[PDB]
DNA sequence: TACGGAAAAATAACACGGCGAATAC
DNA sequence: GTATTCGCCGTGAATAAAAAGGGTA
RNA sequence: GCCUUUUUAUU
């Protein structure tokens, strides 16, 4: 790379970075890891 | 006249002036502050009863049920002191309170407080940690000022701070606009009208209370003003003031002070005044017309020609207004009345609510200052509230009353105009001490109001059918509020207990850090410096320089904590120029008023001063006063020094720049396995060991029957007994807090009688009651072929041979088994149980405790490299290793109780059966389930020790601050050697004395050369086996030198076998005590050098080691006291090539336990790019840490033999790339 | 370590870095200072889709100018106002 | 990148997102954070050949 | 990503992420059941506050705190400040193949060398051992090569000395507020786990051997090892980047060994004898028949070509001529050779002789200045300096001079401000009178009969040898040592009226040591607090000037500034 | 097995420049 | 329109060791 | 396998 461009995050650019959608507030299970 | 433990190693005091008062209890700010906290006193001033009587009785809102309180009781703890230091259980007895349910009593237990041992510390989680005192801001009125260029902008500023014990801070700050603004909790500043209008005060009631009132009278002219005799001081007017045809004040000219006294004899209450002088003033009074009732003028408005014409049609002859002046009465209060938006009472409370209804705004200000639960002032908080305002009494209510706000505003105008002085925060009277029992009173009261809000909600749904007090109060917030303060908090400091000097100085440590005090990194510059009011109370020497200097400072030897909290030191009262035997504790406020003379003054047999003009101080600065004008005198020469600074000899000869560095390193000396006494010390050295709890101090005196290193018994005498004998279990080779050994060796022989104040067994780094922080080596202040470019130390091989500085470090390797104890991995150090046995010589990198996971993979722990040594004991508690301690403590209980009962035998069946049931009572307290962390079944702790051998890299220094490390292990043949043959043990750089005024380390070296030379002659007279009477005359002649020694011992009182055993401790050298400012002079050491075979000169000629030639310049050899520090090279060396990386970012770890990845830092990137090291800086932050795809390709390249670096994408920047991409900011690479 | 995730919020949310900065990026676009641009965000005031009206002025606005203009609160009204204004205009 | 490491990362990153500010890989604090060759050493000769390539 | 906020057997960020998704899921639960307007405006505000607390902390209505009263770390708290990525994880990345231990003197090793420990450098060069084992064929794998290192047999150390024979190793102090904080070295294997940092670069590090524990680093690849030898080596770091004076200055001990040699004494052993050359003075002194300082005539051979003259040169200065290179002149050697004098001696060797005879010359200064300091015997003691007889009369006069000034204030002759400036006037004049009376008792005090008249010559006290040389003591530091320390300052800034009348040799008083700490603890609180300001000034100065790189050879502009030295003072 | 966030906390309360916002003249 | 004070906000060195704490019923 | 606070300590 030769340059780094910084701008505002588009609603389509944020979904382009993410491969999936998270719906659960709990991080992991309480019983097992 | 001397004790039994002092006859073996009697030490000569070199003090010219005798100490008329002995040293008090060093832990008086810790024990006696906490001793009043435990017992149930009837008064509620000091102790836990102040916390109970303030909360109780708990009365619910319309619940018609009250919770009455009568008494509280502390039972015995479930474990002793020795069990909590290895297990992890908090040393805390159950605290039970009797609570009465009235419109039914039970001694209900709510929470546990950590009890204080004889050492003065607490055991929370198996470690010895003690809360420390606080040099915070005292509750009361504080007048501050910031002159110069700090927030001045060309004008002086005066801010008045009223701070409580707890609640909301109240501040009254000025401005460059000259308007008093009130500040609450450092928020947006409000005008000073609405803070006075909230006290049910009208507009006219503010001006007459803060200003003077002048009377006016209407006549045939326009208006007349009554002259006030207290208003002409500093009054410049362009017109002339006349009175009945007599001209007193000239028009357009500044009058002198002659017209003030001339006007006082002819007081006239009426003069003539023009109409333009009154128009510049304010009226400050509302008036109501009699015809229609309309307001003529508003409140606080300036007069004019039209407003003065309305006074004739109104009909009032008397006009009540003020007088403006620039030096007498500041008009800044009247100018604030045009700044505030509102002037009503109800509309001012809603501004405090914004600081918006009417009921919530009224109840907020009543709960801010007028209520006793939120705002509170104790007897010390009202003492400073009354002393700063010059009130009559000192006792008062905790709330801010209606008359207390107007009294601080009168004093604010006095310090503005110059009538009153401004206070300072560095004054010791302005620094209250939140001690051990004072902070435990408040933090238990934090839990007492967390359960007060719990019962205010539970009593609403209660049926009140004679409810039990157990389910009313809950045990969770009362116990956790004490454990959060005594555990993870700013005041619960990690007490370092490698040597007993650090055990005592941590008790006498005054740390301003905390929730009530200011922190270290954000402190101002003025609080770090020492004020001249630190004389006798707080030492200026013991401050841990670095990030926190000035906030943490040690308390002095004779300083005591008052019941209020202010610091006092005892002074000798001088009556008619004669000092008396009694003492008087005076605080820092009474120090400035009294004329207290200095201790360093020659006194006669009666008590008079030999000089007409003696040195003295009044406000702390140096001055000169007579012997009759002084009021008090310092009781001893150890006033301004602490217990850590007093052990440094010749502190008058030592620099204050280096003694600040000297006593900080003295609080971290490691205990040597052989304790050699200081050859040059202080009389305080005998007092640190007898006051420390880690050194075994006998409670009852008498002869001994069985002296062992495990335990010592003492046959109690007929007068000391009340029966039986006492036992003292000595802690042998236990783990301290800093991974350092603690062992208690005995010092008395068999059949040796001791008194109550004597020592039966010296602690770690102690011998025969004298604190031995290090060892006296033959220090030669000379360079030797290098190795002394700086203040580092060149040491002998003799020091390595005879173990003169090798210490023991006992490290803890805990094993969390969430996980079987069996060591079935998919050795010789195990006893077929998975646990290492006692005494195995382990090596760094083997298995220690086997712990496999149920799946079978091995995920157990191992010993790190560099700490290879033997194991002291493996404490297994909650399977074959667990029952070994359970039978060892059973045999220890069968050795403690069987020895107790067999003494009183030489009826009998009842006295034998009562110890059998006490054995099973001690058995039940051991085999029971220990309280551990939830989730595990048992935890095993390995007390792994390692003999830290002296080597190049160990930090060693004296008590004066000769900071350095060991250069190399220089052999005994290479060191310089005197004419008698003995080589030096330490070769030291003599180039510190040009840098700092460190001649006191040479006064110790010259006195150590004299003390060893006398001890060499005693060793010479013992090898030749001379007479006992001729040996007595040499010791009697040796203890008689000096001008006027305060001991004046007599060897004729010592027995023939007593003086023969005296020379055994005198064989290694002569113990010599010298005070810090009443020390030996330059002529007294040269006179002491005339006694020995060595000459009078401090430097003597000697040959070189590797050369064999005599020096043309003689060097100063001697037995200077040196001590090994805690910073050792075995623990402060960490090397990592590859290891485990961090999980947040792909980077190495910190600490030697985490394999030791060295952090570069932002300061070292700029030093690397300064030379132009582009290929090295690109390696230093990518190949080492960031390039995960690169550091494995590099690790396959170095083992191949090719030193080639590839350019890669750093993943540490990809850590940064995801952090910005996790926000709403787009960032990409091109 | 490289793959990320996203959440679909029921209401739009204003960015706190662009809000509390000096100067405010949201405040300079809507030509408002810091004090009133946070009152509509934390649901104390309302803006139209400009002028700032409080909660007690919203009950009279629907019966007087309710058919001419529509007002909302929160960052949904901020996003609708930034969708209404143009960069070149 | 060089301005966000000094101070005001909550402010100067908002100043650069609303304004573009695509830096041309010049500066020493930037090349340290992005992790490549420094243009103030022998990497200046690498940067001299990099301008010859571009 | 989940590796960016990893769970551990509970973090400070994943619990903050639970505050946002709980608010995000509750707003999805309000849309399907047609929630009223009152409850959806409060739920959207706490949803907006959850994102306001996630992306930032400290800029909101109230900063969110944890359960243990600490402020919770947001996404902004882990990107800014010292705990952010920019300072802790992008500028402060931890470094593998790099250790840290205390530093030592190490006088036997050369300037380009230092001392690395045996078990420490084996743990730092652990893949370098594995590379040489697979090259020769002792262990041609990676598993059994780890067993050969951890067994510590005899064949591991012979492999190790080949790797560290000429490998550059970066010695690095943990505070580097200077360019010379990172210097490379070519270490040798020693015992003891401490590094032997060179004494000639000890003044360049600005860090004495006071037990300071500091880092160490190595370059792995060959393009980074040449950066350490050509730029970061201690051999070509003679001159400081700040000034024209060299940063390699003899500070305490090697200059003390040079100062005892370069001295002149009458009635010495072997006074007034001829010597064939400078090398014969080593024969003259090691046999012990002649002293180190004796007025003799030695033959020397000076270069720029060789000239020879018989000038007045003592025995100790004749040891220096075998140490200096050929082209170094004699006129810089003939003085007393103090620390301020030999700063130009190292500078003139860099100027006309070159760097190649400078490294051998600087190492042989350190070899001669250390070995002859053992033969010197320059020490500190109560018999070395002496309280002058004029000091007890000056203090008795100054205590009698403040008696009549105090009596004039009681009668009303002077004011409060005129009296306060007069006491400091008569004490600083007494402090300067006792400074010169103590100086002559250290300059021309001890005399020896040189077979005739008693002549006045320079005293051989070891305190004055450390004072005239300027090595570790200045003119004011020995003033505080043997004489009174003078006027001490108050914590606010004013001066104590009555200064310390006594001195450190016979000890101070209780109040005299207490007012001595009013400038000593104040100056140490000044030292420990300005390093937090100068450390912040170090970051503020580099971060604005890091963009400025030299890029052109010649531009062609004649614009510039006018240069004028300091003229406003009295002396230049 | 649930919600994570609010109001009270009988909270903790610094200092030297700086940038923008809300007033007096 | 022009300052002007102030609320809040940027910063307050660097580096090694130990301790608890890691949500509350 | 860690991380963050707090305390002690070092330069
Ligand atoms: Mg140092």
Curated annotation (Swiss-Prot), chain A:
Post-translational modification summary for this protein: Acetylated on several lysine residues in the presence of glucose.
Practical applications: Co-administration of salinamide and rifampicin or salinamide and myxopyronin suppresses the emergence of resistance to both antibiotics.
Primary role: DNA-dependent RNA polymerase (RNAP) catalyzes the transcription of DNA into RNA using the four ribonucleoside triphosphates as substrates.
Subunit structure: The RNAP catalytic core consists of 2 alpha, 1 beta, 1 beta' and 1 omega subunit. When a sigma factor is associated with the core the holoenzyme is formed, which can initiate transcription. The rRNA transcription and antitermination complex (rrnTAC) consists of RNAP, NusA, NusB, NusE (rpsJ), NusG, SubB, ribosomal protein S4, DNA and precursor rRNA; S4 is more flexible than other subunits.
Family designation: Belongs to the RNA polymerase beta' chain family.
Protein name: DNA-directed RNA polymerase subunit beta'
Swiss-Prot record, chain B:
PANTHER family from the UniProt entry: DNA-DIRECTED RNA POLYMERASE I SUBUNIT 2
Enzyme Commission designation: 2.7.7.6
UniProt-recorded name of the protein: DNA-directed RNA polymerase subunit beta
Modified sites of kind N6-acetyllysine: 912, 1090
Organism per entry: Escherichia coli (strain K12)
Documented effect of changing residue 655 to A/G: Resistant to antibiotics salinamide A and B
Effect of residue 657 to H/K: Resistant to antibiotics salinamide A and B
Summary of the function given for this chain in its UniProt record: DNA-dependent RNA polymerase (RNAP) catalyzes the transcription of DNA into RNA using the four ribonucleoside triphosphates as substrates.
GO cellular component, one term: cytosolic DNA-directed RNA polymerase complex
Record keywords: Acetylation, Antibiotic resistance, DNA-directed RNA polymerase, Nucleotidyltransferase, Transcription, Transferase
KW Lipid biosynthesis (keyword) present: no
């Amino acid at each position: 790379f030769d340059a780094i461009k910084i701008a505002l995050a588009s609603p389509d650019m944020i979904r382009s970075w993410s491969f999936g959608e998270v719906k659960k507030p709990e991080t992991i299970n309480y019983r097992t890891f | 006249v001397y004790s039994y433990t002092e006859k073996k190693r009697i030490r000569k005091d070199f003090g010219k002036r005798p100490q008329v008062l002995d040293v008090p209890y060093l832990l008086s700010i810790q024990l006696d502050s906490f001793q009043k906290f435990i017992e149930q006193d009837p008064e509620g001033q000091y102790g836990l009863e102040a916390a109970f009587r303030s909360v109780f009785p708990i009365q619910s809102y319309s619940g018609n049920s009250e919770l009455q309180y009568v008494s509280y009781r502390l039972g015995e703890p479930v474990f002793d002191v020795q069990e909590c230091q290895i297990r992890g259980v908090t040393y805390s007895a159950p605290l039970r309170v009797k609570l009465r349910l009235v419109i039914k009593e039970q001694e209900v237990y709510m929470g546990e407080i950590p009890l204080m041992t004889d050492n003065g510390t607490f055991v929370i989680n198996g470690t010895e940690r003690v809360i420390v005192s606080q040099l915070h801001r005292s509750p009361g009125v504080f007048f501050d000022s910031d002159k110069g260029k700090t927030h001045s902008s060309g004008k002086v500023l005066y801010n008045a701070r009223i701070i409580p014990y707890r609640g909301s801070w109240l501040d009254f700050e000025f401005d460059p606009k000259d308007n008093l603004f009130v500040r609450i909790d450092r928020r947006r500043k409000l005008p000073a009208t609405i803070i006075l209008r909230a006290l049910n005060y009208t507009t006219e009631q503010i001006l007459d209370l803060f200003f003077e009132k002048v009377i006016f009278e209407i006549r045939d002219n326009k208006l007349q003003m009554e002259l006030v005799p207290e208003r002409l001081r500093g009054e410049t007017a362009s017109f002339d003031i006349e009175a009945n045809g007599k001209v007193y004040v000239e028009k357009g000219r500044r009058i002198t002070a002659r017209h003030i006294r001339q006007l006082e004899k002819d007081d006239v209450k009426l003069i003539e005044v023009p109409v333009e002088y009154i128009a510049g003033k304010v009226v400050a009074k509302d008036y109501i017309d009699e015809s229609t009732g309309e307001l003529i003028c508003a409140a606080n408005m300036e007069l004019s020609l039209d407003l003065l014409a309305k006074l004739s049609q109104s009909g009032h002859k008397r006009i009540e207004t003020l007088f403006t002046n620039d030096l007498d009465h500041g008009p800044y209060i009247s100018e604030t009345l045009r700044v505030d938006p509102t002037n009503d009472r109800l509309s001012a409370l809603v501004e405090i609510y914004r600081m918006p209804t009417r009921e919530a705004a009224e109840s907020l200000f009543e709960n801010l200052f007028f209520s006793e639960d939120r705002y509170d002032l104790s007897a010390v908080g009202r003492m400073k509230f009354n002393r700063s305002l010059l009130r009559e009494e000192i006792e008062g209510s905790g709330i801010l009353s209606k008359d207390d706000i107007i009294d601080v505003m009168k004093k604010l105008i006095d310090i503005r105009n110059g009538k009153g002085e401004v206070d300072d925060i560095d004054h010791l009277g302005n620094r209250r001490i939140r001690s051990v029992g004072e902070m435990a009173e408040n933090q238990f009261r934090v839990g007492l109001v967390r359960v007060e809000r719990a019962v205010k909600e539970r009593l609403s749904l209660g049926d009140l059918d004679t409810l039990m007090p157990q389910d009313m109060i809950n045990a969770k917030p009362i116990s956790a509020a004490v454990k959060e303060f005594f555990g993870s908090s700013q005041l619960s400091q990690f007490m370092d207990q490698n040597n007993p000097l650090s055990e005592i100085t941590h008790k006498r440590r005054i740390s301003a850090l905390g929730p009530g005090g200011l922190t270290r990194e954000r402190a101002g510059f003025e609080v770090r410096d020492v004020h001249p009011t630190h004389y006798g109370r707080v030492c200026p020497i013991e401050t841990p320089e670095g990030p926190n200097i000035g906030l943490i400072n040690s308390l002095s030897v004779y300083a005591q904590t008052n019941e209020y909290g202010f610091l006092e030191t005892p002074y000798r009262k001088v009556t008619d120029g004669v000092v008396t035997d009694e003492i008087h504790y005076l605080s820092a406020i009474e120090e400035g008023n009294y004329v207290i003379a200095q201790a360093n003054s020659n006194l006669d047999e009666e008590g008079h001063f030999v000089e007409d003009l003696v040195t003295c101080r009044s406000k702390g600065e140096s001055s000169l006063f007579s012997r009759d004008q002084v009021d008090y005198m310092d009781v001893s020469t150890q006033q301004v020094v602490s217990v850590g600074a007093s052990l440094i000899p010749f502190l008058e000869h030592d620099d204050a720049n280096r003694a600040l560095m000297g006593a900080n390193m003295q609080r971290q000396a490691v205990p040597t396995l052989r304790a050699d006494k200081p050859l040059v010390g202080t009389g305080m050295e005998r007092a640190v060991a007898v006051d420390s709890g880690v050194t075994a101090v006998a409670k009852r005196g008498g002869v001994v029957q069985y002296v062992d290193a495990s335990r010592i018994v003492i046959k109690v005498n007929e007068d000391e007994m009340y029966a039986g004998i006492d036992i003292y279990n000595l802690t042998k080779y236990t783990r301290s807090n800093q991974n350092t050994c603690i062992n208690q060796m005995p010092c008395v022989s068999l059949g040796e009688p001791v008194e109550r104040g004597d020592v039966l067994a010296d602690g770690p780094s102690t011998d025969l009651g004298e604190l031995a922080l290090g060892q006296n080596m033959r220090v030669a202040f000379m360079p030797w072929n290098g190795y002394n470019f700086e203040d580092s130390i060149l040491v002998s091989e003799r020091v390595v041979q005879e173990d003169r500085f090798t210490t023991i470090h006992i490290q803890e390797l805990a094993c969390v088994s969430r996980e079987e104890i069996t060591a079935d991995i998919p050795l010789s150090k195990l006893d077929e149980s998975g646990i290492v046995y006692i005494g195995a010589e382990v090596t760094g990198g083997d298995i220690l405790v086997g712990k496999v996971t149920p799946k079978v993979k091995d995920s157990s722990l191992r010993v790190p490299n560099g700490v290879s040594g033997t194991v002291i004991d493996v404490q297994v508690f909650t399977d074959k290793r667990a029952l070994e301690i359970e039978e060892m403590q059973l045999k220890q209980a069968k050795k403690d109780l069987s020895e107790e009962l067999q003494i009183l035998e030489a009826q009998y069946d009842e006295l034998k059966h009562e110890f059998e049931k006490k054995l099973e009572a001690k058995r039940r307290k051991i085999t029971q389930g220990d309280d551990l962390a939830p989730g595990v079944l048992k935890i095993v702790k390995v007390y792994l020790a390692v003999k830290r051998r002296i080597q190049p890299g160990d930090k060693m220094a004296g008590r004066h601050g000769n900071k350095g490390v060991i250069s190399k292990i220089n052999p005994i043949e290479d060191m310089p050697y005197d004419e008698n043959g003995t080589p030096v043990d330490i070769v030291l750089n003599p180039l510190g004395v040009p840098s700092r005024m460190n001649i006191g380390q040479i006064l110790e070296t010259h006195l150590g050369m004299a003390a060893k030379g006398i001890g060499d002659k005693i060793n010479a007279m013992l090898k030749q086996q001379q007479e006992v009477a001729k040996l007595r005359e040499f010791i009697q002649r040796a203890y008689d030198l000096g001008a006027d020694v305060r001991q004046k011992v007599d060897l004729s009182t010592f027995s023939d076998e007593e003086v023969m055993r005296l020379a055994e401790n005198l064989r290694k050298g002569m113990p010599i005590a010298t005070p810090v400012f009443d020390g030996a002079k330059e002529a007294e050491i040269k006179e002491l050098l005339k006694l020995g075979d060595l000459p009078t000169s401090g430097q003597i000629r000697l040959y070189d080691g590797r050369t064999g030639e005599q020096f043309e310049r003689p060097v100063t050899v001697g037995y200077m006291y040196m001590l090994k520090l805690n910073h050792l090279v075995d623990d402060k060396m960490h090397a990592r090539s590859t290891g485990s990386y961090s999980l947040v970012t792909q980077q190495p770890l910190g600490g030697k336990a985490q394999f030791g990845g060295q952090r570069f830092g932002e300061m070292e990137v700029w030093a690397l790019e300064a030379y132009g090291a582009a290929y090295t800086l690109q390696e230093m932050l990518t190949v080492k840490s960031d390039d995960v795809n690169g550091r494995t390709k590099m690790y396959k390249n170095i083992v191949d033999g090719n030193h080639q670096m590839e350019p890669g994408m750093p993943e540490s920047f990809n850590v940064l790339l995801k952090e910005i991409r996790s926000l709403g900011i787009n960032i990409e690479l091109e | 370590r490289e793959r990320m995730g996203h959440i679909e919020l029921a209401s739009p949310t204003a960015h706190i870095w662009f809000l509390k900065s000096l100067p405010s990026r949201i405040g300079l676009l809507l030509d408002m200072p810091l004090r009133d641009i946070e009152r509509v965000l934390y649901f104390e005031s309302y803006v139209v889709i400009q002028q700032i009206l409080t909660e007690e002025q919203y009950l009279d606005a629907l019966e007087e100018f309710g058919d001419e203009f529509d007002a909302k609160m929160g960052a949904e009204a901020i996003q609708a106002l930034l969708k209404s204004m143009d960069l070149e205009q | 990148i060089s301005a966000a490491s000094f101070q005001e990362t909550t402010r100067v990153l908002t100043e650069a997102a609303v304004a573009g500010k695509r830096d041309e890989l010049r500066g020493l604090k930037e090349n340290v954070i992005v992790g490549r060759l420094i243009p103030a050493g022998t990497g200046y000769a690498y940067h001299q050949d990099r301008m010859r390539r571009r | 990503p989940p590796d960016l906020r990893p769970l551990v057997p509970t973090s400070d960020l994943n619990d903050l992420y639970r505050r946002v998704i709980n608010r995000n899921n509750r707003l999805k639960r309000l849309l399907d059941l047609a929630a009223p307007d009152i409850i959806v405006r409060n739920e959207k505000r706490m949803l907006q506050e959850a994102v306001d607390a996630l992306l930032d902390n400290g800029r909101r209505g109230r900063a969110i705190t944890g359960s243990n009263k600490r402020p919770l770390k947001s996404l902004a708290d882990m990107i800014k400040g010292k705990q952010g990525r920019f300072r802790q994880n992008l500028l402060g990345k931890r470094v593998d193949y790099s250790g840290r231990s205390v530093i030592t003197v190490g006088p036997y090793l050369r300037l380009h060398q230092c001392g690395l420990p045996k078990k420490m450098a084996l743990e730092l060069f652990k893949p370098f051992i594995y590379g040489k084992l697979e090259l020769r064929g002792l262990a041609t794998t990676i598993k059994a090569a780890k067993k050969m290192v951890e067994r510590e047999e005899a064949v591991v150390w012979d492999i190790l000395d080949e790797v560290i024979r000429e490998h550059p190793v970066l010695l690095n102090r943990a505070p580097t507020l200077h360019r010379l904080g990172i210097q490379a070295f070519e270490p040798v294997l020693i015992e003891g786990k401490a590094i032997q940092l060179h004494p000639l670069v000890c003044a360049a590090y600005n860090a004495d051997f006071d037990g300071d524990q500091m880092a160490v680093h190595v370059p792995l690849t060959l393009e980074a090892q040449l950066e350490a030898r050509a730029l970061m080596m201690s051999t070509n770091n003679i001159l400081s980047p700040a000034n024209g004076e060299p940063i390699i200055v003899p500070s305490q001990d090697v200059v003390l060994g040079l100062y005892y040699m370069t001295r002149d004494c009458v009635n010495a052993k072997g006074e007034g004898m001829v010597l064939t050359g400078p090398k014969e003075a080593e024969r003259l002194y090691r046999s012990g028949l002649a002293s180190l300082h004796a007025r003799v005539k030695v033959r020397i051979t000076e270069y720029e070509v060789a000239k020879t003259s018989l000038k007045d040169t003592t025995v100790g200065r004749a040891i220096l001529w075998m140490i200096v290179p050929k082209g170094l002149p004699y006129s810089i050697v003939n003085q007393a050779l103090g620390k301020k004098a030999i700063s130009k001696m190292l500078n003139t060797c860099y100027r006309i002789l070159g760097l190649k005879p400078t490294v051998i010359f600087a190492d042989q200064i350190m070899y001669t200045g250390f070995a002859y300091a053992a033969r010197s015997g320059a020490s500190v003691g109560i018999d070395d300096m002496v309280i002058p007889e004029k000091k007890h009369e000056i203090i008795s006069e100054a205590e009698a001079e403040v008696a009549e000034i105090q009596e004039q204030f009681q009668s009303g002759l002077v004011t409060a401000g005129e009296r306060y400036n007069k006491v400091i006037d008569i004490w600083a004049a007494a402090n300067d009178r006792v400074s010169k009376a103590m100086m002559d008792n250290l300059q021309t005090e001890t005399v020896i009969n040189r077979d005739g008249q008693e002549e006045k010559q320079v005293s051989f006290n070891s305190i004055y040898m450390m004072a005239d040389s300027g090595a570790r003591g200045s003119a004011a530091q020995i003033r505080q040592l043997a004489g009174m320390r003078g006027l001490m300052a108050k914590p606010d800034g004013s001066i104590i009226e009555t200064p310390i009348t006594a001195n450190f040799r016979e000890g101070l008083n209780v109040l005299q040591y207490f007012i001595s700490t009013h400038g000593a603890r104040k100056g140490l609180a000044d030292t420990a607090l300005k390093t937090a300001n100068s450390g912040y000034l170090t970051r503020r100065l580099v971060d604005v000037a890091q963009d400025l790189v030299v890029t052109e050879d010649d531009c062609g502009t004649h614009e510039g500034i006018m240069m004028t030295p300091v003229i406003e003072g009295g002396d230049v």
